[PDB]
From a paper:
To demonstrate the versatile applicability of spitrobot-2 we demonstrate reaction initiation and fast delay times in three independent model systems, obtained by single crystal rotation data collection: Streptomyces rubiginosus xylose isomerase (XI), human insulin (HI), and bacteriophage T4 lysozyme (T4L). Using 12 crystal structures of three independent model systems, we demonstrate successful cryo-trapping via observation of conformational changes and ligand binding within 25 ms. It is suitable for monitoring ligand binding events as well as conformational changes of main and side chains.
The biological function of T4L is to hydrolyse the β-1,4 linkage between N-acetylmuramic acid and N-acetylglucosamine in bacterial peptidoglycan to aid cell lysis. The L99A mutation of T4L forms an internal non-polar cavity of about 150 Å3, which allows the binding of various ligands after large conformational changes that open T4L to allow ligand binding. As a result, this particular mutant serves as a model system for studying ligand binding at allosteric sites. To explore whether we could induce and capture larger conformational changes, we used indole as a ligand and observed structural changes after 1 s and 10 s, respectively. In addition to indole binding, we clearly observe a conformational change in the backbone of the F-helix of T4L in the indole-bound states, which is shifted by about 1.8 Å compared to the apo state.
Residue numbers in the entry: 1 to 163
The structure:
């Protein structure tokens, strides 16, 4: 288990454009293409991302390419964010993957809502952080994925991802 296998679990793999849990056009391993309701908008973004006229279908290889880029750029965002970096650096490797997971799903702007949880995680109050984490739209809207991420933050183990 590592961040790549974890996000593969949480996001699945689809080779055609689909809508994610928010109704937004997505492809691959949860690569968000656009928030526009226009399928043409999404297809243009896909072509832009892959570098060819895909017609809304990619290969597994191409999907994994987007995925590695997306992960990399998530971590890079964290390290450039003054509010997130101190917390990510306070964390062990397992919990860091949980942090990357949340950013992958909700963005940095998503995770800004989580100041209080962030503090509790930085203080290593795992059980308190876990309770606070779940008082969130995120938990309410995607409960099973959030439970797994919270378990990972609470325990510092991959237990929620074995199987
Ligand atoms: C950096 C980015 C996202 C995060 N979620 C919980 C801790 C944390 C640190």
């Amino acid at each position: 288990m590592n961040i790549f296998e974890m996000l593969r679990i949480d996001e699945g793999l689809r080779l055609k454009i689909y809508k994610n849990t928010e109704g937004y056009y997505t492809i691959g391993i949860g690569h968000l293409l656009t928030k526009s309701p226009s399928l043409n908008a999404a297809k243009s973004e896909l072509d832009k991302a892959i570098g060819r006229n895909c017609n809304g279908v990619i290969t597994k290889d191409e999907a994994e390419k987007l995925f590695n880029q997306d992960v990399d750029a998530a971590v890079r965002g964290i390290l450039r964010n003054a509010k997130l970096k101190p917390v990510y650096d306070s964390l062990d490797a397992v919990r860091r993957a949980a942090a990357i997971n949340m950013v992958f799903q909700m963005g940095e702007t998503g995770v800004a809502g989580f100041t209080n949880s962030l503090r509790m995680l930085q203080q290593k109050r795992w059980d308190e952080a876990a309770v606070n984490l779940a008082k969130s739209r995120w938990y309410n809207q995607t409960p099973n994925r959030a439970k797994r991420v919270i378990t990972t933050f609470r325990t510092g183990t991959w237990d929620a991802y074995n199987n």
